[PDB]
Design a binder for this molecule. Structure first.
Ligand SMILES: CCCCCCCCCCCCCCCCCC(=O)OC[C@H](COP(=O)([O-])OCC(O)COP(=O)([O-])OC[C@@H](COC(=O)CCCCCCCCCCCCCCCCC)OC(=O)CCCCCCCCCCCCCCCCC)OC(=O)CCCCCCCCCCCCCCCCC
Ligand SMILES: CCCCCCCCCCCCCCCCCC(=O)OC[C@H](COP(=O)([O-])OCC(O)COP(=O)([O-])OC[C@@H](COC(=O)CCCCCCCCCCCCCCCCC)OC(=O)CCCCCCCCCCCCCCCCC)OC(=O)CCCCCCCCCCCCCCCCC
Ligand SMILES: COC1=C(OC)C(=O)C(C/C=C(/C)CC/C=C(/C)CC/C=C(/C)CC/C=C(\C)CC/C=C(\C)CC/C=C(\C)CC/C=C(/C)CC/C=C(/C)CC/C=C(/C)CCC=C(C)C)=C(C)C1=O
Ligand SMILES: CCCCCCCCCCCCCCCCC[C@@H](O)O[C@H](CO[C@H](O)CCCCCCCCCCCCCCC)COP(=O)(O)OCC[N+](C)(C)C
Ligand SMILES: CCCCCCCCCCCCCCCCC[C@@H](O)O[C@H](CO[C@H](O)CCCCCCCCCCCCCCC)COP(=O)(O)OCC[N+](C)(C)C
Ligand SMILES: CCCCCCCC/C=C\CCCCCCCC(=O)OC[C@H](COP(=O)(O)OCCN)OC(=O)CCCCCCC/C=C\CCCCCCCC
Ligand SMILES: CCCCCCCC/C=C\CCCCCCCC(=O)O[C@H](COC(=O)CCCCCCC/C=C/CCCCCCCC)COP(=O)(O)OCCN
Ligand SMILES: CCCCCCCC/C=C\CCCCCCCC(=O)O[C@H](COC(=O)CCCCCCC/C=C/CCCCCCCC)COP(=O)(O)OCCN
Lengths: 113, 105, 171, 98, 318, 347, 115, 175, 83
C-alpha cells in the first residue's frame, strides 16, 4: 500500500521536473523564432504595400479603359466620404482576375492541410 | 429602468465588449477600427438627437466599411461592363488578369 | 466622394529580394542586427502615416539595405550560409534547433570576417527609438472638425417659481 | 448582403415557423427551438468572424450554454407532461382556458 | 498524388482489421488453452479472407418491419467514420494536418454513436432497441469524463495539434507525468469502443446480438470492420498521447516502426482484458464513470491547470 | 420544495431582473432574461399538480419563443451596426422584432393568450410574483429604447391590450383570471404613454404594482380563488372585504383614489402631443375593467351572500401568519392622490 | 479541399461495399425469413412502443455538463495570458461550481436510476 | 463565383432546417438537425472559425443523443412518420423547399429587397479582409479572452449552470 | 481534534477516491498562492513577442529607450536563460 503510492508520487515528481525543464526550453526557442519573424517583418510589409498598390493601379487602368463609354462614371472614384487610406477589400484586389487565384487568395490558408 | 451601477462604482462589468475599438487581446484591430473611432469621437457628448444628424457622414462611412454595399455595386457595374465589352470583342483583357503576370514578392 | 490617388507603376518598381523564406529565416538575426535603422524608420513611417502611399521611399531603402546585407554575405562566405539554410529548408516547420552546427559555423564566419555578433535572446523584440527628419503628421485620420458641444449648465439654483405649478397644487 | 446571410436568416424563419405551427408532439417543437438556437449561433459567428471583432468570439459559446439550459428545462417539463398522460401531445395541455 | 495517399491509408487499415480478427481469435485461444484458427491457411493466415468472402457472398436480408433508409445508412456511416478517424493521426506526418485534431477526433467519435443508434432503431426489433438504448447510456456515462481527461492531458502540450505531441514527449513519455489520467483514459477508451468489460450494446449473452441482431452478410461485416478499425485507431491515439516515440526528420521510418509496435501492444492489451474479466452491468458503468472517474478527473483537471503556473512550465504556441 | 432552495430560486429570479436593469450590453440583458426564466419555472410548479405543470409548460414555451426573437433582433442590429450597447436600434426590422419579443414577454395583445391560463394554473403567491415582478425587466428595456419604437405598432398593441383586458375580464368568475385580464389592460395603459414619457410609464407601473400587491395579499389572507369562495369572507372577516372593496374601487380609477392618478397623468401627457382620440377611447374602454371590479365588489362586500354552517368553527381561530406590508400597501393603493406632484422625483 | 475529398472517398467506398453486398449474392427472400427475431416466437407487442428510461435525470444533467466542456477547452490558450492570477481564479471557480453541482445531484439521489 | 461551396453548404443547412421543421417523427427531426449542425460547422470553418464550428457540432451531437433517448422513451407511436407518410408533413417539406428555391432564384437572377435589404450575389469571397500577419489564431485568442476579460460572463454562466442543475432537480421531483 | 481524525479514517476506509479528489483539488487551489514561480510564469508570458515592437519617435528626452536592439538599455531576458 505505502510502497505503491510512494513509487507513484516519485514517478509523478520526476515527470514534473523533466517537463518543467523541457517546457522552459520550448518557451525560449519560441521567443527566438518569434524574434526572427520580428526581424523579417519590415521587408514583408514593404513588399506587401507595393504589391497591393500595383494591383490597385492595374485595376484602375483596366477600369479606365473599360468604362470610357459609360457617360457619368468617375474613374477611381471612392465610395467613402473620408480621404484617408482604407485597406482594400480583397474583392477589389481580385475583382478582374481568374477564378483559380481568387480561390487561392480566399481559401488557400483554410484549405491547406 | 437602467440603474447605471457600473459608472457609479467604476466597475466595468460589460463595457469592455460593447465596441469594436476597445482594447482587444494582443492589440488585434477590428476590420473597421478607424471608422468606428471617428464616428464615436464625432458623436461623443452631443446627444443622440444631434449625433443622428451631425455625424451622419462618419456613420455612413462606418456602415460602408461594415457591409461594403457600395463597393459591391461598383464592382458589379465594372464586371458587367467588362462582360458586355468582351462578348462583342471590343475589349480584350490583358495578360496579367488572365494568369500570365510576372509575380513579385 | 473624390478620386483615390494611386502611384504609377514606375515608382512602385524596386530591386526585389528574390531569396526564399528559409534563406531569410537563416539570415534573420544578423539581418535585424545590421539593417535596423532603415527598417525602424520605415516602420515608424508606417505606423505614423497609416498610409502605404506615404512610405514608399523608406520601403525602397529597406530593400536596398537588405540587398547590401545579402551581397556582403555572398561576398565573404557563401558556403557556410548555404549549408545552414539548406538544413533550415529541410524542416517542414523550419526549426532553428535542428541546425545548430551549421549555425555555429555561419556565426563564426560572420564574426571573424565581418565582426557580426548574433543578437541575444530578448534583444530583437525591444521597443527602440528612431530619429527622423520626417515631420509628425497632423491629422493622419483625416478627421473632420468635431461638432461643438452643448454649451453648459451654469448659475445658482433657485426654488421653482410658484412651486410645481401642477393643476391645482400651490406647492 | 451575401446569399449565405439570407440563407441563415431563412433557416431561422423556417425554424420559428416550425415552432409556431404545432403538430401533436412537443418534442418536435423542442427540436424547432434548438434549431433556432443553432441558426442564431451560425449567424452571430459569421458576423463576428467577418468584422474581426475579437472579443465577441466568446459570445456564441455563451449563447450555446444558455441554449443547453433551455433544452434541459424543456426536456424536464416534457417528462412531467408524459408522466401525467403517457404521451407528449400538446392536446393534453387544455385544463386551462382563457 | 493525394488520392494515392488516401488509398495507401485506407487499404492497409482494412487489411490490419482483417488480420486483427485472426490475432484476437488466436490470442483468446491460447489464453484458453487451445490454438484457435490454424487450418485455413498456414497458421490460419487465410482465415480472414475466407470469412470476408463468405460474408460478402451470403444473402443480406431486409427485415419486413424495418425502416430501410436508416437500416442501410447506418453501416455506411459506421465504416466511413471509422476510416475518417485516421486522417489527422501523425505517423509521424499526418495525412491531414489540423490545428485542432483532437477536437476533430472528439466530434467524429461523438458522431459515430449514431450508427449504432440508427441501426438499432431502424431494425424495428426489441433486442436491437435495447442495444441502442444501452449505447445512449454508455455515451452519457463516458463522454464528459473522456473530454475532461483529454483537456487535462493536453494542458501540457500547449495546443490541440496532434503532431505537437511528438515534440512535447521528446525526452520523457507523458505517461510519467499523468499516469492517473492515462489509467482512466484507458478505461474510457474501453467504454468508447464498446469493448469488454463494457461490450454492453452487443451483449451476446444478454441480448443475442444487441443492436445488430437483424444484420447479416455485408452490412454485418461492415459493422465489425468499423469496430475493429476503431479499436486500432483508439489504441494508436493513446500511444501518441502517452507513449511518445522519438522522431528523426531524416529517418521517419524509425518513428513509424516504434509507433506501430506501441499500438500493437495496446491492442493486444485490449484482447487480454477481454480474455480476463466478466462484463459490467450498464448502470454500474454509469456509476463507475460518474461517482469515481468524474470527481478524480475534476480534481486532476484543477491540478493540471495549476501545475504549469506554479512551476513556471507553461508550454508555447498560444 | 426546500426553503433554502426556494430562497435561492427567488434570489436568482431577482438577480436576473437586476442584471437586465443594470446592463449596458445586449448579451447581458439577454442572459438576465434567460436566468430569470430558468429560475422562474420551478417557482410556478412549487405546488405540484397537473395544472401547475401545464401552466409552467405554456409559460416556458412563450418566454423561450420571445427570447429567440429577442436574440434575433440583437443579432440583426449588430449586423447593420457593430454595436452591442442598448441605446437605440439602428435597423427598423430589428426594432420591430425586438418590440414584438418584448410585447410577447409582457403579455400585450395579441400575445396575451398565455397570461390568464398561467395565472389560473399557479398558486396565488406565484401569481403575485408573475404579475408584479416579471414586468420590470421588459418595461425597463422598452424604456431604454423608447425613442426607437415605432409609435403605430406600440399604440395598436396598447389599445388592443386595453380592449381585450376589459372584454375578457367581463366573462370571469375565477379571481386569478380577473387579475390577469386586469394586468393586460394595465400593461396596455403603461405601453401607450411610453413613446411620449417614460416617467409616466414608471409611475403607472409603481401604482399598479402597489394595488396588485394589495389585492393578492388580501386574496391570500382570505384564501379565496373564486367569486363564491370570496362571498363567504364577510361572515368571517368583514374588515377584509371592506378593504378589498375600496381597493377594487381604486383599481377602477375612480377619483379621489390613487388608481385615478396614473390615467389622469397619462391622458394629460398625451394631450401635450396632440393625441385626443386615443386617450378618449382608452378611458371609455377602462370603464369595462371598472364594471367587472364593481361586480366583484357587489358579490363580496356591498351585499351579503349565504354562508355555511361549518363557518362557525372558523369563527374560533385567528390568522396564523401576518402580512407586515399589507396595511402600507392598502394605504398606498388608496390615499396618495394629494401627493401627485412627487412624481417629479421619478425623472 | 483535401478533407472533402477524403470524406467523399470513404463514403463512396462504404456505399460500393453495400452495393456489392446487395447485388452479388443470390437472394431468396420470403415473409418467414424477413420476420422480426425474438429467439423463437412472434413478438407480443410492437418494438415502437414506449421504452421507459430510468436514467432520464442523468441524461438531462449530461446536457448541462456537456456545455461545461465547451467552457473549458479554451484553457490551453487562456494559460498564455499575462494576468494569470485572474484566469486561474476563474478557471478554478468554474470547475468548483461543476463539482458542487455534481455534489448537489449526488446527495439529492439524482444519480440513482428510477426504480 | 468561387465554386459556390459555401452557397451549397448554406442551401443544405436550409434543407435540413426544413426537414426538421416540417416535424416528422423526432428520430428524423433529430437526424435533420444533426445534418444541419454538420453543414453549419462546415460553413463556419470556411470562414476561419474552426473551434466554433467543431464545438457547436460536438454540442449538438450530444444534445441529439439525449433527444433520441427521450424520443424512444416518450415521443414514439405505433407508426413513426417520415416525410412521405403524411400529407401535412410532405406538404410542409415541399413548401419549404419551393420557397427556398424561390428566394434563391429571386436573389441571384435579379437584385431585390426580400424582407430587410437586397442582395446581388458575387459569392462570399468578396467580403473577406486579406489581412496578413500572426503566429496565432484570432478566434482562439478571442475565445481564450473569456478568462481574462470576461470575468463577469464566467460568473453569470457558472451560476446559471449550477442553478440549472438545481432547477431540473426540482422540476422532476413530482410529489 | 480527534473527531476530524476519526472522520478522515472512516472516509479513507470507505471512499478513498473522494478523499484523494478532495486532497488534490485543495492542493490545486492553495499551492499557487504560495509558489514563487507564479510570477516567473507571468514574466515568461509577458516576454513572448507576438506582435511587432513599434519604434518610438526620438524627441531627445528618452534616456531609457535603446537606439538599437543590442544597446544596453531596455528589458533583458538574462533571467530567462538561467532558468
Ligand atoms: C398637526 C397640524 C399641523 O401641525 O399643521 C401645520 C400646517 C401649517 O400650515 P401652513 O403652511 O402654515 O398653512 C398653509 C395653508 O394651509 C395654505 O395652504 P398651502 O398653500 O400651504 O397649501 C399646500 C398645498 C399642498 O398640500 C397638500 O398637497 C396636502 C394637503 C392635504 C390635501 C387634502 C387631503 C388631505 C386632508 O395644498 C394644495 O395644493 C391644495 C390642493 C389640495 C388637494 C390636493 C389633491 C387632493 C384633492 C382631494 C382629493 O397646517 C396643516 O398641516 C393643516 C393640516 C394639513
Ligand atoms: C433536398 C430534397 C431531399 C433530398 C433527399 C436526400 C436523398 C435521399 C432520398 C432517397 C431516400 C428514400 C428512399 C426510400 O425511401 O427507399 C427506397 C426503396 C423503397 O423502399 P420500400 O421498402 O419499397 O418502401 C419503404 C417506404 O417507402 C418508407 O420506407 P423508409 O421509412 O425507410 O423511408 C424513409 C426515407 C424516405 O424519404 C422521405 O421520406 C422523403 C425524402 C426527403 C429526405 C430529406 C430530409 C432532410 C434531411 C436533412 C437534409 C439532408 C441533405 C439533403 C440535401 C441533399 C444534397 C446533399 O427518408 C429517410 O430516412 C432519408 C434520410 C436521408 C438522410 C441521410 C443523412 C445521413 C446522416 C449521416 C450523418 C450526417 C453528418 C453531418 C452532416 O428502398 C430501397 O431501394 C433501399 C433504400 C435506399 C437507401 C439508400 C441510402 C439512403 C438515401 C441517401 C441519403 C443521402 C446521402 C447523402
Ligand atoms: C468466444 O467466442 C467468440 C469468438 O472466439 C471464437 C470470436 O472470435 C467472435 C468474433 C467473431 C469472429 C469469428 C471474427 C469473424 C471474422 C470477421 C467478421 C471477418 C472480417 C474480415 C473482413 C470483413 C475485413 C475486410 C476483408 C478484406 C480482405 C480486407 C481488405 C479490404 C479490401 C477492400 C482491400 C465472437 C463474436 C465470439 O463469440
Ligand atoms: C471494393 C469496392 C469497389 C469494387 C469495384 C467494382 C464495383 C462494382 C459495383 C457493384 C455491382 C457488382 C455486383 C456483381 C453482380 C452484378 C449485379 C447486376 O448488376 O447484374 C444484373 C444486372 O442485370 C439487370 O437486371 C438487367 C440487364 C440489363 C439492364 C439494362 C441496363 C443497360 C445495359 C444495356 C446493355 C448494352 C451493352 C452494355 C455494355 C457495353 C442484376 O441481375 P439480378 O438477377 O436482378 O440480381 C441478382 C444478381 N445475381 C444474379 C448475380 C445474383
Ligand atoms: C456591491 C455588493 C458586493 C457583494 C454582492 C456582489 C453580487 C455579485 C457577485 C460578485 C460580483 C462580481 C463583480 C466584479 C466583476 C469582475 C471584474 C473586475 O472585478 O475585475 C476582474 C477581477 O477578477 C477577480 O478575479 C475577481 C473575480 C473573483 C469572483 C469569483 C467568485 C465570487 C463570485 C460569488 C457570487 C457569484 C454567484 C455565486 C457563485 C458560487 C478582472 O480584472 P483584471 O483581469 O485584473 O483586469 C481586467 C482588464 N484587462 C483584462 C484589460 C487586463
Ligand atoms: C461532417 C463534419 C465534418 C467536419 C470537418 C472538419 C475538418 C477540419 O477540422 O479541418 C479543418 C480544415 C483546416 O483547418 P485548420 O487546419 O484547423 O486551420 C486552417 C489552417 N490550415 O479546414 C477546412 O479545410 C474546411 C473545408 C470545408 C469543411 C468541410 C465541410 C464538409 C461538410 C459535409 C457535407 C457533405 C454533404 C452534406 C450532407 C452529408 C450527408 C447527407
Ligand atoms: C503531488 C500531487 C500529485 C497528484 C495526485 C497523484 C496521485 C493520485 C493517486 C490516485 C490515482 C488513482 C487513479 C485511478 C483512477 C480509478 C480508481 C478507482 O477507484 O476506480 C475503481 C474501479 O476502476 C476499475 O477498476 C476499472 C474496472 C475495469 C478494468 C478494465 C481493465 C483493467 C485495467 C488494465 C490495465 C490498465 C492500464 C492503463 C494504462 C494504459 C497506458 C495508456 C473504483 O471502483 P470500485 O472499486 O468499484 O469502488 C468505487 C465504488 N465503491
Ligand atoms: C478545497 C478544494 C475543493 C475542490 C476539489 C474537489 C474536486 C472534485 C471533487 C468533488 C467532486 C464531487 C464530490 C461528490 C460528493 C459525494 C457526496 C456523497 O454522497 O457522499 C457519500 C459517501 O459519503 C462520503 O462523502 C465519503 C466521506 C465524506 C466525503 C469524502 C471525504 C471529504 C474530504 C476528505 C479529504 C480531506 C483532505 C485530505 C486530508 C488528508 C490528511 C491531511 C456517497 O456515497 P453513497 O453513494 O451515497 O453510498 C451508497 C453506496 N454505499
Amino acid at each position: 500500500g505505502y510502497s505503491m503510492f510512494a513509487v507513484g508520487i516519485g514517478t509523478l515528481l520526476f515527470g514534473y521536473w523533466s517537463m518543467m525543464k523541457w517546457n522552459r526550453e520550448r518557451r525560449r526557442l519560441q521567443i527566438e523564432d518569434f524574434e526572427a519573424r520580428i526581424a523579417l517583418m519590415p521587408l514583408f510589409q514593404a513588399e506587401k504595400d507595393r504589391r497591393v498598390l500595383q494591383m490597385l493601379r492595374e485595376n484602375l487602368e483596366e477600369e479606365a479603359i473599360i468604362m470610357k463609354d459609360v457617360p457619368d462614371w468617375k474613374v477611381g472614384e471612392s465610395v467613402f466620404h473620408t480621404t484617408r487610406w482604407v485597406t482594400p477589400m480583397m474583392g477589389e484586389l481580385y475583382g478582374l482576375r481568374t477564378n483559380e487565384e481568387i480561390l487561392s487568395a480566399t481559401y488557400g490558408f483554410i484549405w491547406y492541410t | 429602468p437602467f440603474f447605471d451601477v457600473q459608472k457609479r462604482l467604476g466597475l466595468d462589468l460589460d463595457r469592455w465588449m460593447t465596441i469594436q475599438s476597445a482594447e482587444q487581446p494582443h492589440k488585434i484591430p477590428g476590420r473597421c477600427h478607424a471608422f468606428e473611432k471617428e464616428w464615436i469621437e464625432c458623436a461623443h457628448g452631443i446627444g443622440g438627437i444631434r449625433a443622428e444628424k451631425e455625424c451622419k457622414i462618419e456613420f455612413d462611412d462606418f456602415v460602408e466599411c461594415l457591409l461594403r454595399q457600395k463597393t459591391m455595386k461598383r464592382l458589379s457595374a465594372i464586371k458587367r461592363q467588362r462582360d458586355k465589352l468582351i462578348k462583342e470583342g471590343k475589349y480584350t483583357p490583358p495578360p496579367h488578369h488572365l494568369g500570365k503576370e510576372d509575380p513579385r514578392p | 466622394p473624390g478620386i483615390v490617388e494611386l502611384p504609377t507603376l514606375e515608382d512602385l518598381k524596386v530591386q526585389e529580394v528574390k531569396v526564399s523564406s528559409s534563406v531569410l529565416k537563416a539570415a534573420a538575426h544578423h539581418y535585424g542586427a545590421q539593417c535596423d535603422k532603415p527598417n525602424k524608420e520605415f516602420m515608424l513611417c508606417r505606423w505614423e502615416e497609416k498610409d502605404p502611399r506615404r512610405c514608399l521611399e523608406e520601403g525602397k531603402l529597406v530593400n536596398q539595405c537588405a540587398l547590401d546585407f545579402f551581397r556582403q554575405i555572398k561576398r565573404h562566405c557563401a558556403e557556410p550560409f548555404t549549408e545552414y539554410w539548406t538544413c533550415i529548408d529541410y524542416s517542414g516547420l523550419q526549426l532553428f534547433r535542428h541546425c545548430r552546427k551549421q549555425q555555429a559555423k555561419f556565426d563564426e564566419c560572420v564574426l571573424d570576417k565581418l565582426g557580426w555578433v548574433r543578437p541575444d535572446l530578448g534583444e530583437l523584440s525591444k521597443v527602440t527609438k528612431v530619429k527622423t527628419d520626417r515631420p509628425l503628421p497632423e491629422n493622419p485620420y483625416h478627421s473632420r472638425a468635431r461638432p461643438e458641444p452643448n454649451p453648459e449648465a451654469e448659475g445658482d439654483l433657485k426654488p421653482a417659481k410658484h412651486g410645481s405649478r401642477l393643476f391645482f397644487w400651490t406647492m | 448582403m451575401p446569399l449565405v446571410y439570407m440563407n441563415i436568416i431563412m433557416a431561422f424563419a423556417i425554424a420559428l415557423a416550425g415552432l409556431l405551427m404545432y403538430r401533436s408532439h412537443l418534442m418536435s417543437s423542442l427540436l424547432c427551438l434548438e434549431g433556432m438556437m443553432l441558426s442564431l449561433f451560425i449567424m452571430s459567428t459569421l458576423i463576428i468572424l467577418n468584422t474581426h471583432f475579437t472579443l465577441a468570439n466568446m459570445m456564441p459559446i455563451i449563447l450555446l450554454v444558455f441554449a443547453a439550459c433551455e433544452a434541459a428545462l424543456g426536456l424536464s417539463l416534457l417528462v412531467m407532461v408524459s408522466n401525467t398522460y403517457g404521451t407528449d401531445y400538446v392536446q393534453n395541455l387544455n385544463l386551462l382556458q382563457c | 498524388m493525394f488520392m494515392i495517399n488516401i488509398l495507401s491509408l485506407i487499404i492497409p487499415i482494412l487489411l490490419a482489421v482483417a488480420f486483427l480478427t485472426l490475432v484476437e481469435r488466436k490470442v483468446l485461444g491460447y489464453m484458453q488453452l487451445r490454438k484457435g484458427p490454424n487450418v485455413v491457411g498456414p497458421y490460419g493466415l487465410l482465415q480472414p479472407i475466407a470469412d470476408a468472402l463468405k460474408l460478402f457472398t451470403k444473402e443480406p436480408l431486409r427485415p419486413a418491419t424495418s425502416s430501410i433508409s436508416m437500416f442501410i445508412i447506418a453501416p455506411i456511416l459506421a465504416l466511413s467514420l471509422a476510416l475518417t478517424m485516421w486522417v489527422p493521426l501523425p505517423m509521424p506526418y499526418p495525412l491531414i494536418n489540423m490545428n485542432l485534431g483532437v477536437l476533430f477526433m472528439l466530434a467524429m467519435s461523438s458522431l459515430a454513436v449514431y450508427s449504432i443508434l440508427w441501426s438499432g432503431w431502424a431494425s424495428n426489433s426489441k433486442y436491437a432497441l435495447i442495444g441502442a438504448l444501452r449505447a445512449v447510456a454508455q455515451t452519457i456515462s463516458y463522454e464528459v469524463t473522456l473530454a475532461i481527461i483529454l483537456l487535462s492531458v493536453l494542458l501540457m502540450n500547449g495546443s490541440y495539434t496532434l503532431s505537437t505531441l511528438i515534440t512535447t514527449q521528446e525526452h520523457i513519455w507523458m505517461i510519467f507525468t499523468s499516469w492517473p489520467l492515462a489509467m482512466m483514459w484507458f478505461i474510457s477508451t474501453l467504454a468508447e469502443t464498446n469493448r469488454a468489460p463494457f461490450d454492453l450494446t452487443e451483449g451476446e449473452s444478454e441480448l443475442v446480438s444487441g443492436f445488430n441482431v437483424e444484420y447479416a452478410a455485408g452490412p454485418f461485416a461492415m459493422f465489425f470492420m468499423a469496430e475493429y478499425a476503431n479499436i486500432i485507431m483508439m489504441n494508436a491515439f493513446t500511444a501518441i498521447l502517452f507513449l511518445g516515440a522519438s522522431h528523426d526528420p531524416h529517418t521517419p521510418e524509425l518513428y513509424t516502426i516504434n509507433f506501430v509496435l506501441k499500438t500493437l501492444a495496446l491492442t493486444i492489451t485490449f484482447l487480454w482484458i477481454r480474455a480476463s474479466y466478466p462484463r459490467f452491468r450498464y448502470d454500474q458503468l454509469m456509476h463507475l464513470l460518474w461517482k469515481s472517474f468524474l470527481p478524480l478527473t475534476l480534481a486532476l483537471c484543477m491540478w493540471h491547470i495549476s501545475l504549469p503556473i506554479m512551476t513556471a512550465s507553461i508550454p508555447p504556441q498560444s | 420544495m426546500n426553503p433554502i432552495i426556494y430562497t435561492t430560486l427567488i434570489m436568482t429570479v431577482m438577480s436576473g431582473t437586476m442584471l437586465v436593469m443594470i446592463s449596458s450590453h445586449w448579451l447581458l440583458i439577454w442572459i438576465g432574461f434567460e436566468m430569470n426564466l430558468l429560475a422562474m419555472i420551478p417557482v410556478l410548479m412549487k405546488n405540484f399538480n397537473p395544472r401547475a405543470t401545464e401552466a409552467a409548460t405554456k409559460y416556458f414555451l412563450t418566454q423561450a419563443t420571445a427570447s429567440m426573437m429577442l436574440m434575433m433582433a440583437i443579432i440583426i442590429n449588430l449586423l447593420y451596426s457593430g454595436q452591442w450597447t442598448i441605446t437605440k436600434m439602428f435597423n427598423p426590422v430589428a426594432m420591430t422584432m425586438m418590440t414584438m419579443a418584448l410585447a410577447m414577454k409582457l403579455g400585450l395583445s395579441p400575445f396575451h393568450f398565455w397570461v390568464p391560463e398561467v395565472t389560473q394554473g399557479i398558486s396565488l403567491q406565484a401569481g403575485l410574483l408573475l404579475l408584479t415582478w416579471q414586468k420590470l425587466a421588459p418595461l425597463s428595456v422598452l424604456c431604454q429604447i423608447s425613442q426607437s419604437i415605432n409609435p403605430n405598432l406600440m399604440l395598436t398593441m396598447a389599445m388592443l391590450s386595453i380592449l381585450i383586458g376589459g372584454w375578457g375580464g367581463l366573462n370571469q368568475t375565477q379571481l386569478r383570471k380577473i387579475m390577469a385580464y386586469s394586468s393586460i389592460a394595465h400593461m396596455g395603459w403603461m405601453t401607450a404613454v411610453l413613446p411620449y414619457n417614460t416617467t409616466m410609464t414608471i409611475l403607472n407601473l409603481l401604482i399598479y404594482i402597489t394595488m396588485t400587491l394589495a389585492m393578492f395579499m388580501l386574496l391570500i389572507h382570505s384564501s379565496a380563488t373564486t367569486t363564491l369562495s370570496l362571498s363567504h369572507t364577510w361572515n368571517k372577516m368583514p374588515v377584509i372585504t371592506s378593504l378589498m372593496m375600496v381597493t377594487l374601487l381604486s383599481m377602477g380609477g375612480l377619483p379621489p383614489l390613487s388608481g385615478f392618478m396614473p390615467k389622469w397623468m397619462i391622458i394629460q401627457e398625451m394631450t401635450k402631443n396632440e393625441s385626443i382620440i386615443m386617450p378618449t377611447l382608452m378611458a371609455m374602454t377602462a370603464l369595462l375593467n371598472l364594471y367587472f371590479y364593481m361586480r366583484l365588489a357587489y358579490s363580496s362586500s356591498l351585499t351579503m351572500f349565504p354562508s355555511t354552517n361549518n363557518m362557525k368553527m372558523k369563527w374560533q381561530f385567528e390568522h396564523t401568519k401576518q402580512m407586515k406590508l399589507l396595511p402600507t400597501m392598502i394605504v398606498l393603493s388608496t390615499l396618495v392622490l394629494p401627493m401627485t406632484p412627487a412624481l417629479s422625483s421619478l425623472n | 479541399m483535401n478533407i472533402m475529398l477524403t470524406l467523399l472517398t470513404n463514403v463512396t467506398l462504404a456505399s460500393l461495399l453495400v452495393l456489392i453486398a446487395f447485388w452479388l449474392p443470390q437472394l431468396n427472400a420470403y415473409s418467414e425469413k424477413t420476420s422480426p427475431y425474438e429467439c423463437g416466437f412472434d413478438p407480443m407487442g410492437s418494438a415502437r412502443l414506449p421504452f421507459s428510461m430510468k436514467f432520464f435525470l442523468v441524461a438531462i444533467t449530461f446536457l448541462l455538463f456537456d456545455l461545461e466542456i465547451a467552457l473549458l477547452l479554451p484553457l490551453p490558450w487562456a494559460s498564455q495570458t499575462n494576468n494569470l492570477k485572474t484566469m486561474l481564479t476563474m478557471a478554478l471557480f468554474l470547475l468548483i461550481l461543476l463539482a458542487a453541482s455534481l455534489a448537489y445531484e449526488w446527495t439529492q439521489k439524482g444519480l440513482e436510476w428510477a426504480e | 463565383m468561387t465554386m459556390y461551396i459555401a452557397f451549397i453548404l448554406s442551401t443544405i443547412f436550409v434543407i435540413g432546417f426544413v426537414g426538421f421543421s416540417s416535424k416528422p417523427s423526432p428520430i428524423y427531426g433529430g437526424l435533420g438537425l444533426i445534418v444541419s449542425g454538420g453543414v453549419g460547422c462546415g460553413i463556419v470553418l470556411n470562414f476561419g472559425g474552426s473551434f466554433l464550428g467543431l464545438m457547436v457540432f460536438l454540442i449538438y451531437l450530444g444534445g441529439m443523443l439525449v433527444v433520441f433517448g427521450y424520443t424512444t422513451a416518450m415521443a414514439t407511436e405505433m407508426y413513426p412518420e417520415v416525410w412521405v407518410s403524411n400529407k401535412t408533413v410532405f406538404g410542409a417539406f415541399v413548401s419549404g423547399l419551393m420557397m427556398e428555391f424561390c428566394m434563391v432564384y429571386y436573389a441571384l437572377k435579379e437584385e431585390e429587397v426580400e424582407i430587410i435589404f437586397k442582395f446581388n450575389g458575387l459569392g462570399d469571397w468578396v467580403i473577406y479582409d486579406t489581412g496578413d500577419s500572426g503566429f496565432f489564431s484570432e478566434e482562439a485568442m478571442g475565445i481564450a479572452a473569456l478568462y481574462s476579460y470576461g470575468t463577469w460572463l464566467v460568473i453569470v454562466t457558472g451560476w446559471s449552470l449550477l442553478i440549472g442543475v438545481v432547477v431540473i432537480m426540482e422540476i422532476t421531483r413530482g410529489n | 481534534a480527534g473527531r476530524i481524525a476519526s472522520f478522515l479514517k472512516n472516509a479513507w476506509a470507505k471512499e478513498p477516491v473522494l478523499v484523494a479528489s478532495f486532497a488534490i483539488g485543495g492542493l490545486a487551489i492553495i499551492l499557487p498562492s504560495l509558489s514563487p514561480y507564479t510570477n516567473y510564469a507571468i514574466r515568461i508570458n509577458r516576454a513572448t513577442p507576438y506582435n511587432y515592437p513599434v519604434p518610438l519617435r526620438d524627441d531627445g528626452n528618452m534616456p531609457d529607450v535603446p537606439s538599437h536592439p543590442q544597446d544596453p538599455q531596455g528589458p533583458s531576458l538574462e533571467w530567462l536563460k538561467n532558468l
